[PDB]
Amino acid sequence: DIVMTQSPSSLSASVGDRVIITCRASQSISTYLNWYQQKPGKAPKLLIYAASSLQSGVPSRFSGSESGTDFTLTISGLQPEDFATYYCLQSYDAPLTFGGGTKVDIK
């Protein structure tokens, strides 16, 4: 089974800060990685797909890049609504696997 290691498990940030979230695969999954953004009691929402593409209706603060098995989520400018728990998911082979997450708090 392909494993997914997201880093860090929690992160502290302020509004306007640059936030870097990383994601590492056990095997090579090409560009089949997605990023999600989940708020307490809400279904998770799709931000990045194809490791870098932007989902319609998502602001351009979120941005994804890929370097081999290593993937990066990047929110250059944080709004007061960008504090949520993010995950990366490999969409390549099954079983499909999600990371541990990343809790972004207020600093």
């Binding site: 997605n34 797909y49 194809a50 998911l89 969409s91």
Partner: peptide, 10 residues
């Protein structure tokens, strides 16, 4: 669209 999970339910 690269086998992405985009439509979730409540």
């Amino acid at each position: 669209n690269y086998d992405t999970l985009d439509i979730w339910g409540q």
